[PDB]
Design a protein around this ligand. Structure first.
Ligand SMILES: CCCCCCCCCCCCCCCCCC(=O)OC[C@H](COP(=O)([O-])OCC(O)COP(=O)([O-])OC[C@@H](COC(=O)CCCCCCCCCCCCCCCCC)OC(=O)CCCCCCCCCCCCCCCCC)OC(=O)CCCCCCCCCCCCCCCCC
Ligand SMILES: COC1=C(OC)C(=O)C(C/C=C(/C)CC/C=C(/C)CC/C=C(/C)CC/C=C(\C)CC/C=C(\C)CC/C=C(\C)CC/C=C(/C)CC/C=C(/C)CC/C=C(/C)CCC=C(C)C)=C(C)C1=O
Ligand SMILES: COC1=C(OC)C(=O)C(C/C=C(/C)CC/C=C(/C)CC/C=C(/C)CC/C=C(\C)CC/C=C(\C)CC/C=C(\C)CC/C=C(/C)CC/C=C(/C)CC/C=C(/C)CCC=C(C)C)=C(C)C1=O
Ligand SMILES: CCCCCCCCCCCCCCCCC[C@@H](O)O[C@H](CO[C@H](O)CCCCCCCCCCCCCCC)COP(=O)(O)OCC[N+](C)(C)C
Ligand SMILES: CCCCCCCCCCCCCCCCC[C@@H](O)O[C@H](CO[C@H](O)CCCCCCCCCCCCCCC)COP(=O)(O)OCC[N+](C)(C)C
Ligand SMILES: CCCCCCCC/C=C\CCCCCCCC(=O)OC[C@H](COP(=O)(O)OCCN)OC(=O)CCCCCCC/C=C\CCCCCCCC
Ligand SMILES: CCCCCCCC/C=C\CCCCCCCC(=O)OC[C@H](COP(=O)(O)OCCN)OC(=O)CCCCCCC/C=C\CCCCCCCC
Ligand SMILES: CCCCCCCC/C=C\CCCCCCCC(=O)OC[C@H](COP(=O)(O)OCCN)OC(=O)CCCCCCC/C=C\CCCCCCCC
Ligand SMILES: CCCCCCCC/C=C\CCCCCCCC(=O)O[C@H](COC(=O)CCCCCCC/C=C/CCCCCCCC)COP(=O)(O)OCCN
Ligand SMILES: CCCCCCCCCCC1=C(C)C(=O)C(OC)=C(OC)C1=O
Ligand code: SF4
Ligand code: SF4
Ligand code: SF4
Lengths: 318, 96, 70, 156, 176, 115, 215, 171
């Protein structure tokens, strides 16, 4: 019965991811005064299926200079980690209930970048190497600020348990108490998913395809679905963190609907942001994260340590 | 004004000869608008006009399902338009 | 159209509806229909083990009321 | 027979998937490529047909040769055609690509790209209009729809 | 006369300084760009439904070539070879001889469509309106050889497109 | 037990996807197809040559700043102590030293990349 | 490469991502136009200039026509000259739209390209209505223009022109005051006036450095 | 033998099973392989030659190799570890029959196992490539253009004159 729940988690996520690509294409088309896919199926509803079938009936190639073991390992790790990131999310009940969910997601996200690094290195190409180095720089840019933002926001929750966030926001969304950090947090998620204006590891206009330039067919498809699943997962985590939905124990479907709507809104906001802005330079992202986000994050960490003690509002469950 | 647009959608559904014609035109042209019929080919292509649309969408053709020797229910192309309706359809003239 | 973007989004929503809902229903199906017990600390696990021991069927969720004190 | 029916249905499925997802390489040479830009522009919106530009040859399905192929450029075009995974297709667009065109008698021009790579569709024009190139793409889609790989394998 | 594009200074009063600090910290111009894209989202797209709808053309449009006839059915071409002489791409090849009735007619009239630059100089040079560039543009082939037209192919194109060609010439000939 | 099973399921699905990708389609691999890609041409040198890193100092500083996270994450539990004054003083002291280290590296041109 | 315009082979020596040397390799689109012109008559040689700079067609036509008219010692009629200047400005609009939008595309702003290429399509309609070709018009010839404007063309040009300003405004909204665009473009590729003069620059490449020159 | 052959590529791909199975260790088989371009040029010259109407030609290479030495040279050019072991004829026939059940192109067949382990016939009474004006190309000049595809990244740039031409049993 637990395998049934695992499958009921993973398969709809993949289906959602496939449809996300269609949604992303149509939203960008309509913001660019065009339509996007509307031919393959009504309203383009069959486009993701055709894309997947095309990609998995296409010949995958092994570069002659490539390191085969890491070349095959990297997409597997990417997809498996993208699926694993979803298990502690409470909607409103998690598949895996952990005392430290936030730290688990932090560690898994930290491990996820090695798929990019190892694929870029094992491709044994120059553009792939440049993309891998850009991934290294991006992680160095955002990691510390993201972690300190999480700590400061969770200081008002009382623990690292994700489901407790539902209890913390029984009456008001956490954004109303931490909208500065939230803003910074949002940008960090953009940097964590390698999304515009921080899509540097791919860098189509500069690096052709970046780290995955040597990948084709199924491994490339797996990298794609891993990226989109990470997008949806990070937006879901943000929705749980900062937009608390009201949960009624005898009717969890209301929480499920509210959570899904908020996650969809945040993902559509990501698509909008991609449609609106140019691309950063990968040293400018480092300077942004280390000279603007880090000082404010440190000051707000001090503030959010001091505030519960000042107001006698320390949360329970040591 | 939401009810107005929903009623317009229902009108588009009903004006294609029912639900079956609506689905036929939707899966044959990815378009479900209704326009004033201008004429028909000897090969079976129908030509519709709607002057309220913007330039480019104000004239269109529903292709036949059977030209000279092949079945064109799904496989249609712009080379199936005869020269007179080709001149009309490409806005080289304002006269059908 | 712009509303032609809505269908795909709808499909997306449907998919995202399934996991959480599924979990909830499964949690009710394998825990007596009463919201699977949470054991974050040792005390709650001890309570669960005592319930399993005294249920008589090796299942913690089979709850015995005052009808069991003769 | 049952096997003939099954392989025909599988051929239909694979052909539909391959022709409904056509990803040309980001590859253009001259004036013709400009019209290619107008084929992706909102008026024609090739993305609505499932046609997406992708820069990497490893992630591309179609090569559209839009422009004059010179002798200095021929090895590069052949190289990036060979690095395309199969099944792959080539669309020759414009006069220069088709047979040399205005520079046919030059000392530095390849008299047609079919001397370097096999060609599936030839789109005439100098340059062909965006509608003409879209017609060529749809013709290539029909040609893919006519493929019978699994039937041929079964009858072997 | 000239103007400067980047020669403006910002005011240093507390109002403007606080406004600029608020712009830096709360990202107002980025929200303006988001609003612009959102405004474009709700507009009607400019896409047409090809092949069921077509982009507009003109009577002067230069498409596929055709050889024309007089209303009696006689060919207009007299093998003068002006189009061959004027062709910038040397796409036209012509051979001629007296016909069985002594008429000046072509025996070979080929146009290499893969050499053609579609400039329309041939129909400008023609004195009898024999060769024209028709309205057709959807004639892509699957082999190179199918784009090497001979006299029969061009005469068939004329016979097939004459109804539209005559109308376009009627609409355009007063400018020529 | 449940987490191990979940990890095994995810890894198995990814591996099966790779197997399908590599065993279903028709492969025609020759030398020119599998060569490295440099947009039209054979690369001059190897991709295993040294690649200079201009942000190496920031990379070293990231190692020291990452352990501040290790020192700071127990704060939600530390806030539940009786002597809140000492805990608040120590947390503020640690954050002040982190900010001072950042300021020192900033003022000495340590955040600027090599030229 | 998406940013190499198709036929540029830039051999770059990099130290990390710092550019130590740029070595442009060109000739991947060398078709030998100048040698081919020597076998054509002047009218036959005219359409090569359409294909020289295929983003600004009538401007090259006009330059070649002016050179041939100067050598012929003849003068075009006034209406031909006015039509030439009008379509040259239309061509300038086309060229600047393409330049700015592809520049933004290379930087990463992909949306204004689609907004402005509809206007480019409308100007292509103007070209086709005047000559029968969307881009390679061959309209401007030594001595004037090939054909007169069809009736109703000026009204449609006026209709386009009375609305193009808002498209320029929307592009400027999306790019000009954005801090990311400024971070990507400010103080990048700085060239001095003396270096620009000695290196043979012209047009905006001069006027960006304060040089007050325009032909 | 050539780029798209099933002769050099066959032995090179047999590296995927760890050890190389050879009947009688390949010590009782002699091979005389011929280049693909040589065969095609011979066909063309036979078309253009007027005396070759009703003749029968034998197209063979300039050298004869014991199968063991040939396979060892093939593995040496591919820079792959050579691990030959003897397999009984019935066992190798059973392996070929096992591989024969593939609905796709078989990896090997019983007929292939038979044909690999037969010595090439000698027919000196028949005209050869030299009668059509062709000098047969030795295997040691063209083996790299087929076997360089089977190398790892570490040995891709190794030259042709690096790999010690194999010993030939030439009469
Ligand atoms: C005790 C034994 C230890 C067991 C090791 C595990 C098994 C891996 C070894 C087999 C792979 C090598 C086969 C090969 O050479 O090419 C295959 C074959 C030959 O290719 P070729 O072109 O003819 O020649 C290749 C050349 O030889 C040169 O080709 P190359 O450059 O690619 O060779 C490199 C390869 C060659 O390997 C070797 O040199 C010898 C193998 C010893 C490696 C062990 C060192 C210890 C490393 C750390 C511990 C690993 C786990 C150990 C515990 C095992 C118990 C679970 O080294 C490796 O990459 C092995 C790395 C395995 C670690 C994978 C773990 C993923 C980490 C994810 C994050 C971790 C999260 C926290 C947990 O090509 C193929 O068939 C296609 C791809 C097949 C490989 C796919 C993936 C590899 C297997 C999965 C990894 C196991 C994970 C479980
Ligand atoms: C500015 O141009 C661009 C765009 O605009 C035109 C884009 O859209 C765009 C985005 C890329 C698109 C082409 C989307 C591509 C779509 C995917 C590659 C398809 C992947 C979908 C599958 C592989 C997911 C799995 C499929 C299954 C059906 C899911 C169910 C799983 C089972 C186990 C059940 C890019 C990069 C771009 O550059
Ligand atoms: C030239 O022709 C040929 C091909 O065409 C190009 C092939 O693909 C081909 C097969 C391609 C190989 C890569 C297949 C290698 C895979 C093997 C079956 C692996 C050996 C056994 C595995 C299951 C590994 C596990 C070993 C034991 C546990 C059993 C062969 C052999 C061939 O000869
Ligand atoms: C279950 C997980 C493993 C399998 C994964 C696959 C999941 C199912 C795949 C879904 C298939 C749907 C595709 C069908 C869409 C076709 C729609 C229709 O248009 O097709 C027409 C005809 O249909 C096609 O000929 C056949 C397509 C379907 C093939 C038969 C179904 C086979 C299903 C077998 C499933 C087995 C999966 C593997 C099991 C292990 C051709 O029209 P077309 O020319 O394009 O359109 C012209 C464009 N116009 C209109 C704008 C002018
Ligand atoms: C969506 C997630 C879940 C998916 C669930 C399904 C997972 C499927 C995994 C992927 C396999 C499907 C892809 C291809 C079909 C299987 C055939 C192939 O994989 O193996 C063949 C197996 O053939 C072997 O080489 C030898 C055949 C026999 C092997 C001996 C084993 C014992 C058989 C003895 C006969 C008695 C019957 C035994 C069965 C009971 C080798 O084919 P090969 O040509 O290389 O590669 C080209 C593949 N093409 C042709 C489709 C393009
Ligand atoms: C169905 C047939 C199954 C055969 C299995 C053999 C596997 C194999 O190595 O074959 C190579 C095969 C295809 O190559 P070819 O043989 O050239 O193409 C086939 C057509 N000629 O290559 C592959 O695809 C290998 C796929 C790997 C198998 C899965 C094992 C990998 C395990 C990785 C674990 C590490 C994941 C990291 C995440 C864990 C961290 C939490
Ligand atoms: C990859 C790294 C594995 C890390 C696993 C982290 C999972 C996790 O944190 O869940 C915690 C979970 C519950 O803990 P609490 O939150 O305290 O709740 C119980 C109190 N009521 O802990 C567990 O369930 C322990 C289960 C065993 C740990 C899993 C071990 C996995 C380690 C990786 C092994 C991978 C396979 C080996 C091969 C290596 C690669 C080739
Ligand atoms: C994650 C999304 C996608 C996941 C993957 C699921 C895909 C399911 C749909 C599969 C569609 C059917 C695939 C058919 C294409 C197979 C590759 C191919 O084209 O090979 C053609 C090949 C041509 O060979 P020849 O004619 O002899 O030689 C020509 C060269 N000299 O013919 C074949 O080998 C046919 C092989 C039979 C295909 C078996 C497929 C059966 C269904 C398996 C689906 C797996 C789903 C799990
Ligand atoms: C009484 C005591 C109370 C305690 C004090 C509380 C008051 C706090 C007031 C200040 C809060 C400021 C929060 C903002 C944090 C960072 C903002 C910032 O200053 O960074 C910008 C940069 O920020 C950006 O420009 C972002 C770039 C990427 C933009 C990506 C898309 C834009 C976001 C779209 C909407 C965001 C939605 C956020 C919420 C999502 C829902 C969770 C500075 O960069 P530069 O202009 O280059 O100048 C640096 C040199 N001086
Ligand atoms: C996504 C927006 C559409 C992009 C179309 C990509 C076309 C690829 C051709 C390459 C090319 C580019 C990029 C280009 O910018 C250009 O103008 C100088 C060319 O000359 C016509 C080109 O050939
Ligand atoms: S065919 Fe004409 S438009 Fe196309 S590249 Fe050649 S000269 Fe330019
Ligand atoms: S249109 Fe121009 S290039 Fe084509 S045949 Fe006529 S004169 Fe020659
Ligand atoms: S088509 Fe006209 S110009 Fe050409 S040979 Fe015939 S009559 Fe003369």
């Amino acid at each position: 019965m637990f395998m049934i729940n695992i499958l009921s988690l993973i398969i709809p996520i993949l289906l959602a991811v496939a449809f996300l690509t269609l949604v992303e294409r149509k939203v960008l088309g309509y913001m660019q005064l065009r339509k996007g896919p509307n031919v393959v199926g009504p309203y383009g509803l069959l486009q993701p299926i055709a894309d997947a079938l095309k990609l998995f009936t296409k010949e995958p190639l092994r570069p002659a200079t490539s390191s085969i073991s890491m070349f095959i390992i990297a997409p597997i790790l990417a997809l498996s980690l993208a699926l694993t990131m979803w298990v502690p999310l409470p909607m409103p009940y998690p598949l895996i209930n952990m005392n430290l969910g936030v730290l688990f997601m932090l560690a898994m996200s930290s491990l996820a970048v090695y798929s990019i690094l190892w694929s870029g290195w094992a491709s044994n190409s120059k553009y792939a190497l440049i993309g891998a180095l850009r991934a290294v720089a991006q992680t160095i840019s955002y990691e510390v600020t993201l972690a300190i933002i999480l700590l400061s926001v969770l200081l008002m929750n009382g623990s690292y348990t994700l489901s407790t966030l539902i209890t913390t926001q029984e009456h008001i969304w956490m954004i109303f108490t931490s909208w500065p950090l939230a803003m910074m947090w949002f940008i960090s998620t953009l940097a964590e998913t390698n999304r515009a204006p921080f899509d540097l590891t791919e860098g189509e206009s500069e690096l052709v395809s970046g780290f995955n330039v040597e990948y084709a067919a199924g491994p490339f498809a797996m990298f794609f679905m891993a990226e989109y699943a990470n997008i949806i997962m990070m937006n879901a985590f943000t929705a749980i963190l900062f937009l608390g939905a009201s949960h009624d124990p005898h009717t969890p479907e209301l929480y499920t609907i509210n959570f899904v709507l908020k996650t969809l809104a945040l993902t559509i906001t990501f698509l909008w942001i991609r449609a609106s802005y140019p691309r950063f330079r990968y040293d400018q992202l480092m300077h942004l994260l280390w000279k603007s986000f880090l000082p404010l994050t440190l000051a707000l960490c001090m503030w959010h340590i001091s505030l519960p003690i000042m107001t006698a509002s320390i949360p329970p469950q040591s | 004004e939401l009810v107005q647009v929903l009623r317009r959608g229902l009108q588009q559904v009903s004006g294609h000869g029912g639900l079956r014609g609506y689905l036929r035109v939707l899966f044959r042209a990815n378009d479900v608008r209704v326009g004033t019929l201008v004429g028909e080919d000897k090969y079976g292509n129908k030509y519709y006009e709607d002057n309220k649309q913007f330039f480019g969408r104000h004239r269109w053709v529903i292709y036949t399902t059977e030209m000279n020797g092949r079945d064109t229910f799904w496989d249609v192309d712009g080379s199936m338009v005869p020269p007179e309706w080709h001149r009309w359809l490409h806005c080289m003239t304002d006269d059908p | 159209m712009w509303f032609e973007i809505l269908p795909g989004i709808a499909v997306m929503a449907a998919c995202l509806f399934i996991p959480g809902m599924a979990t909830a229903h499964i949690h009710k199906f394998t825990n007596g229909g009463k919201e699977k017990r949470v054991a974050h600390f040792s005390y709650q696990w001890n309570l669960m083990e005592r319930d399993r021991r005294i249920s008589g069927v090796n299942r913690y969720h089979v709850t015995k009321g005052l009808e069991n004190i003769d | 027979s049952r096997g003939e029916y099954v392989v025909a249905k599988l051929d239909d499925l694979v052909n539909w998937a391959r022709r409904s997802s056509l990803w040309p390489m980001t590859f253009g040479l001259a004036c013709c490529a400009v019209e290619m830009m107008h084929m992706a522009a909102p008026r024609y919106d090739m993305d609505r047909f499932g046609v997406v530009f992708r820069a990497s040859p490893r992630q591309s399905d179609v090569m559209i040769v839009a422009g004059t192929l010179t002798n200095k450029m021929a090895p590069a075009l052949r190289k990036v055609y060979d690095q395309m995974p199969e099944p792959r297709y080539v669309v020759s667009m414009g006069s220069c690509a088709n047979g040399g065109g205005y520079y046919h008698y030059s000392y530095s021009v390849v008299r047609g790209c079919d001397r370097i790579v096999p060609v599936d569709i030839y789109v005439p024009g100098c340059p062909p209009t965006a509608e003409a190139l879209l017609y060529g793409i749809l013709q290539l889609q029909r040609k893919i729809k006519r493929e019978k790989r699994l039937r041929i394998w079964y009858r072997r | 006369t000239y103007k400067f594009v980047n020669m403006r200074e910002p005011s240093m009063d507390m109002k403007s300084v606080t406004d600029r600090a608020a712009q830096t910290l709360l990202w107002t111009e980025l929200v303006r760009g988001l609003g612009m894209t959102l405004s474009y989202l709700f507009r009607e797209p400019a896409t047409i439904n090809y092949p069921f709808e077509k982009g507009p053309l003109s009577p002067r449009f230069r498409g596929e070539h055709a050889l024309r006839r007089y209303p009696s059915g006689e060919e207009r071409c007299i093998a003068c070879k002006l189009c061959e002489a004027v062709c910038p791409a040397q796409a036209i090849t012509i051979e001629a001889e007296p016909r069985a009735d002594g008429s000046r007619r072509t025996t070979r009239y080929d146009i290499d469509m893969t050499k053609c630059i579609y400039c329309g100089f041939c129909q400008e040079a023609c004195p009898v309106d024999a060769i024209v560039e028709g309205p057709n543009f959807e004639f892509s082939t699957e082999t190179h050889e199918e784009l090497l037209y001979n006299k029969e192919k061009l005469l068939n194109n004329g016979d097939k497109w004459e109804a539209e060609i005559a109308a376009n010439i009627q609409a355009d000939y007063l400018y020529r | 037990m449940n987490i191990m099973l979940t990890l095994l399921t995810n890894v198995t699905l990814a591996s099966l996807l790779v197997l399908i990708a590599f065993w279903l389609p028709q492969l025609n691999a020759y030398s020119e197809k599998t060569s490295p890609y440099e947009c039209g041409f054979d690369p001059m040198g190897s991709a295993r040559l040294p690649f200079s890193m201009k942000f190496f100092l920031v990379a070293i500083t990231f190692l020291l700043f990452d352990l501040e996270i290790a020192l700071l994450l127990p704060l939600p539990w530390a806030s539940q102590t009786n002597n809140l004054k000492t805990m608040l003083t120590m947390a503020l002291f640690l954050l002040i030293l982190l900010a001072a280290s950042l300021a020192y590296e900033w003022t000495q041109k340590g955040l600027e990349w090599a030229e | 490469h998406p940013a190499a315009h198709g036929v540029l082979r830039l051999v770059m020596e990099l130290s990390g991502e710092m550019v130590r040397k740029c070595d442009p390799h060109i000739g991947l689109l060398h078709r030998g136009t100048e040698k081919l012109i020597e076998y054509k008559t002047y009218l036959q040689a005219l359409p090569y200039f359409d294909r020289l700079d295929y983003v600004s067609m009538m401007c090259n036509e006009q330059a070649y026509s002016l050179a041939v008219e100067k050598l012929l010692n003849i003068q075009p009629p006034p209406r031909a000259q006015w039509i030439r200047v009008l379509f040259g400005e239309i061509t300038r609009l086309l060229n600047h739209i393409m330049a700015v939008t592809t520049h933004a595309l290379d930087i990463g702003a992909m949306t204004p390209f689609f907004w402005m290429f509809e206007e480019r399509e409308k100007m292509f309609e103007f070209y086709e209505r005047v000559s029968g070709a969307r881009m390679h018009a061959a309209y401007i010839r030594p001595g004037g223009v090939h054909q007169d404007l069809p009736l109703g063309l000026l009204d449609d040009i006026y209709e386009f022109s009375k609305n193009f300003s808002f498209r320029i405004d929307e592009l400027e909204e999306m790019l000009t005051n954005n801090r990311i665009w400024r971070n990507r473009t400010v103080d990048i590729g700085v060239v001095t006036a003396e270096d620009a003069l000695n290196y043979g620059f012209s047009g905006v490449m001069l006027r960006g450095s304060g040089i007050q020159w325009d032909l | 033998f050539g780029r798209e052959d099933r002769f050099l590529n066959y032995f090179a791909s047999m590296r995927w099973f760890g050890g190389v199975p050879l009947i009688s260790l390949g010590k009782e088989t002699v091979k005389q392989p011929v280049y693909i371009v040589d065969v095609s040029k011979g066909i063309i010259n036979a078309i253009k030659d007027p005396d070759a109407k009703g003749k029968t030609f034998a197209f063979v290479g300039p050298n004869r190799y014991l199968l063991f030495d040939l396979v060892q040279y093939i593995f040496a050019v591919a820079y792959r570890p050579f691990l030959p072991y003897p397999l009984p004829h019935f066992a190798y026939r059973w392996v070929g029959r096992l591989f024969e059940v593939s609905p796709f192109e078989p990896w090997t067949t019983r007929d292939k196992v038979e044909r690999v382990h037969m010595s090439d016939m000698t027919l000196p009474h028949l005209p050869g490539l030299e009668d059509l004006g062709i000098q047969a190309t030795p295997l040691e000049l063209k083996a790299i253009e087929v076997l360089r595809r089977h190398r790892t990244y570490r040995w891709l740039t190794s030259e042709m004159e690096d790999v010690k031409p194999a010993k030939t049993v030439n009469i």
